[PDB]
Amino acid sequence: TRTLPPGVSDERFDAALQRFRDVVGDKWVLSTADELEAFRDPYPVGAAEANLPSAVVSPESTEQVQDIVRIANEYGIPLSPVSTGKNNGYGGAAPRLSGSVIVKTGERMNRILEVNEKYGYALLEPGVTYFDLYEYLQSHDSGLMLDCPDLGWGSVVGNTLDRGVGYTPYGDHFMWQTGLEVVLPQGEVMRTGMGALPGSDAWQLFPYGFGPFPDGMFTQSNLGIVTKMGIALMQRPPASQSFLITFDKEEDLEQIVDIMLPLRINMAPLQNVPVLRNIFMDAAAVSKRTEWFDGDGPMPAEAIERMKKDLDLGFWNFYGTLYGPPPLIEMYYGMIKEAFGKIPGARFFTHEERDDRGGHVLQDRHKINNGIPSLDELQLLDWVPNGGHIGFSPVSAPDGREAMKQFEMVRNRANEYNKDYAAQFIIGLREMHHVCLFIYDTAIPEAREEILQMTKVLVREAAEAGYGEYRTHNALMDDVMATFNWGDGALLKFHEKIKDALDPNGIIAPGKSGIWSQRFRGQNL
Amino acid sequence: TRTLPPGVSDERFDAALQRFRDVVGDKWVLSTADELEAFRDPYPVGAAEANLPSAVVSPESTEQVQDIVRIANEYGIPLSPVSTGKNNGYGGAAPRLSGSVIVKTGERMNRILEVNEKYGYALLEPGVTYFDLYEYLQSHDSGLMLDCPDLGWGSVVGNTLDRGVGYTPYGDHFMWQTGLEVVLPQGEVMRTGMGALPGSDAWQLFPYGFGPFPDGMFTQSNLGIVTKMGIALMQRPPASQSFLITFDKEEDLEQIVDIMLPLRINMAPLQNVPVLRNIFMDAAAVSKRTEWFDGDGPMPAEAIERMKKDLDLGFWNFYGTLYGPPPLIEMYYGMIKEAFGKIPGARFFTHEERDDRGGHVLQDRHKINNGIPSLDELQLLDWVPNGGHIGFSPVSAPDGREAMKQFEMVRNRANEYNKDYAAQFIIGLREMHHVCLFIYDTAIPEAREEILQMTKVLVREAAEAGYGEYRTHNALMDDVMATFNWGDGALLKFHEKIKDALDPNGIIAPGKSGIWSQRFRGQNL
Ligand SMILES: *Cc1cc2c(cc1C)nc1c(=O)[nH]c(=O)nc-1n2C[C@H](O)[C@H](O)[C@H](O)COP(=O)(O)OP(=O)(O)OC[C@H]1O[C@@H](n2cnc3c(N)ncnc32)[C@H](O)[C@@H]1O
Ligand SMILES: *Cc1cc2c(cc1C)nc1c(=O)[nH]c(=O)nc-1n2C[C@H](O)[C@H](O)[C@H](O)COP(=O)(O)OP(=O)(O)OC[C@H]1O[C@@H](n2cnc3c(N)ncnc32)[C@H](O)[C@@H]1O
Ligand SMILES: COc1cc(/C=C/C=O)ccc1O
Ligand SMILES: COc1cc(/C=C/C=O)ccc1O
């Protein structure tokens, strides 16, 4: 049965499709069940089908984006913009509201508009992937490096717009975003910062421009369709060295985090964004669950021990990268060893010292931390059949007690619902993104359902403990936004007021981050 | 006669004043011409009077701020919030719209709410000055340092809200701002980021929270009255060293900037925010204009040579600070000498080597760059009698040709309008704030008008060359915003739409950054 935009009839929809085809060309509007299967969430959550798109439109220019938007306003059709649509763990390309049209900006708006060697930046269309950018930089023998997330097939823009992260010193992607072009919800185009000044060369040089600074408002947001974005690029250092610290016990988490803080808060000796990964995360990247335990339930303790012993890893594995001339790297590594070697059982390895299977994550982090994109982490999804993940991503103080509490709260529900808890703490200067990846068999309805129910429980329980998520799945956006309800929902109300003013017809990605325009509020969508 | 809010009668204003007194106390509402003289622009611009407050209200708490806002909605009274109201150069405490009531939040909301040593942050009310924070840090023997502007009497909050700058590695104040509380234009209170999650300890740890990130929209803005703000604070390094490089010729500017960029863009060896100051800036900091020249018109070349020789300074004077272990400092300083030494006539002094009158600026920079607040730069205002200044503050690429172009363009008009051009380039990673400070005799109506006309021409002319200002004076806000008119004034249209949705009655600082609510649009005040 045909997915349609809410309250839009089969023929009003057919009319709009034709209008879209006039803008973008026939090839670039998809609308059949078979074409649309590929734009469903690849890692579905919940037993019931959700997040169904009614069509995909692929514009080639900003002007085409403005025309699609205007058409959409005329018909009341919701539009859900994506760049490359690889937001897996959080919905993939699928819209929050069933029946919305995906605007897949990145299919043809994929140009590298500028890479400036002198000032260290790029101006990009949404379709540029980390692999694309890396190839450009290699080809031109650039002195610049990118900063990539774990999987390079996403979009430099797309990822920044969801405030995604990577692992070099430029790991906070939104922090390095400088300038954007956006189509607002009625079709007007606007440039932020110095791009609002006609003829300025400083769009990618000074982010703020003049007056109220809005670029943040277009991240985790449904206020427009972004068409161009700048990002600062770091200079490649002359030398780098990555390392692994293995820690034997579950219980070491607290001491690892407490030792780490003072070595990280000033960006030295911990220069890059360290990651702290549990054995579940690291074993799934190199092996199948059945290698260690056949059995539908929680993995017993001896099977955990064998994971550790066979891969020669700890329960907790700390990965970091140092940059600079070699004498600096040695001084900083020396400090890291001295500090973390206070933990009994800690062992250290550089990227030159492990060529075994357990060392494969280290080699992969060594690429990622040097801005070399990779797809090796896709192997996580082979942990179980028809493997999917969801990201439960609370923020934590860089405090060992708080990290242990979150770990324990999540582990306990993971056990109750029969899901493996793979953990990656992504360590900022003053906070950690505690990413909890739950790998599961996307073909079993009941696994899909337990995932949904488990993660709903974790959102509420984390909030009752004072913890919020940095980012979340379509399925949890309402639940997550409901937690940020200080002052009787003041934040949500503010966002709705802005949304309604910029988008009086309720066109752009309704429900993104729990923000619903007026015509959809109070409904069960 | 009495300054009254536009469209508001004596009788209604009297009623509104009494209601303000009900909220804050009789003593905390000022309304006589005598009491209000202190809230006039201390550096008035334009011959004609402008920017006249109708009153000043000083609330004690967020709750009183809410109550005030409610009252002003009911009566149609415009409110102009300040923290300490020391925005000298840009208007002081004076409101953009004459007749507005100033809400001086900092008079009584002046607590340090939290300084967290472990995570390196403060949570502040608006009345905390840089002096007050420095004192607290000193008294508690903190390992943290603050980052201050040139004058320490302003507000950590207020300064940040105008996207002000300082000179340590944390010199971009807005970058380090983390969390805020704001009273919206109809009286509702909101917290941003992790502060929107009840019980979170991460308000000052993770800036973004969940969903669209709004904090920027409260900077250079009239969308609410901020009542609390957090800021990250850097750890004090073990050692530091400041230096001065003097360069003999006006024309050295191009090469100085070109040599500088590769040393700045990686944050090393130029670790702090370097400043490049011209001789008029430096001479005004330690001497009066009549020591060098007492004729009519622009100072002649021979008199400029005398300033340089007597103070032992260059036409351009570069100040920087290095931080870290001593051998790191020496290695960086060596790199700096070697790079800038290419410029014929360059001379180098550290803060340990110069204690003379000309070295007074270096000593002041060595305090400021180590987070020790100062009022020594108030001496600039003694350059001429009744001295005041205005900041004309274009953004520059960190490119020598661009900086030279800006310099020549500004110099040409400075000479034409007989105003001395003191320049301070404030050097970020990828951009410079080129602060053109014109010091003038505020008593003379011709001088004030010439300042006004000159700056209007500079705004226009800079924009014709593709240059825009980062911040500006009350008197230039409409002109500066009119320059950011890409896409047919798209940016301003966006702002007005938000302004009208949040502030339906047009209450908060109408005209800030050229953003006027609907009721004032087109009235020419
Ligand atoms: C499964 C998984 C996921 C993952 C990861 C490891 C694994 C095994 N590691 C990640 C990491 O290290 N860091 C990180 O930030 N994310 C990581 N993920 C999650 C995900 O794969 C990536 O973040 C991915 O890069 C995101 O996908 P993409 O880059 O393709 O972005 P998108 O889906 O197009 O868009 C994301 C959302 O942003 C808004 N958006 C995007 N484009 C626009 C435009 N043009 N206009 C308006 N809004 C836009 C939409 O909300 C969209 O849903
Ligand atoms: C004359 C001068 C000025 C100067 C300077 C040197 C001289 C000789 N050096 C500066 C520097 O190195 N860096 C810098 O950023 N500014 C410099 N200036 C200019 C000025 O002195 C300082 O910026 C000063 O710190 C600013 O004044 P203050 O800190 O008192 O800020 P304010 O007047 O209260 O507020 C400024 C504007 O911000 C908005 N505002 C402020 N508080 C609020 C609240 N609570 N809510 C909403 N908006 C707020 C208003 O727009 C206000 O006008
Ligand atoms: C799904 O969401 C995320 C995954 C990862 C990385 C996981 C390990 O490869 C990081 C940040 C995220 O938000
Ligand atoms: C008036 O505005 C400014 C002054 C200064 C510094 C002046 C030199 O003492 C820096 C930044 C500004 O925006």
Author numbering:
A (entry chain B), B (entry chain A): 2 to 526
Article sentences:
Among them, one gene codes for a eugenol oxidase (EUGO) that displays significant sequence identity with VAO (≈40 %) and a similar but not fully overlapping pattern of substrate preferences. In addition to the oxidation of vanillyl alcohol and the hydroxylation of eugenol, EUGO can efficiently catalyze the dehydrogenation of various phenolic ketones and the selective oxidation of a racemic secondary alcohol—4‐(1‐hydroxyethyl)‐2‐methoxyphenol. The overall structure of EUGO is highly similar to that of VAO, as indicated by a 1.1 Å rmsd for 490 Cα atom pairs (45 % sequence identity). As predicted, EUGO also shares with VAO the presence of a characteristic covalent bond between His390 (equivalent to His422 of VAO) and the C8M atom of the flavin ring.
Incubation of eugenol (1) with the enzyme in Tris⋅HCl buffer (pH 8.0) containing 1 % (v/v) DMSO afforded coniferyl alcohol (2) with complete conversion after 4 h at room temperature. The structural bases of substrate and inhibitor binding by the cavity were explored by solving the crystal structures of EUGO in complexes with isoeugenol (inhibitor), coniferyl alcohol (2, reaction product and inhibitor), and vanillin (4, reaction product); these were obtained by crystal soaking, resulting in highly defined electron density maps. All these ligands bind with their aromatic moiety stacking against the pyrimidine ring of the flavin and the Cα atom of the aliphatic substituent lying right above the flavin N5 atom at a distance of 3.2 Å. In this orientation, the ligand 4‐hydroxy group is H‐bonded to Tyr91 and Tyr471 and is also in close contact with Arg472 (3.5 Å). These three residues are involved in the stabilization of the phenolate form of the substrate and are strictly conserved in VAO. Collectively, these features are fully consistent with the substrate being bound in the phenolic form and oxidized through a reaction mechanism involving a hydride transfer from the Cα to the flavin N5, coupled to the stabilization of a p‐quinone methide intermediate as demonstrated for VAO.
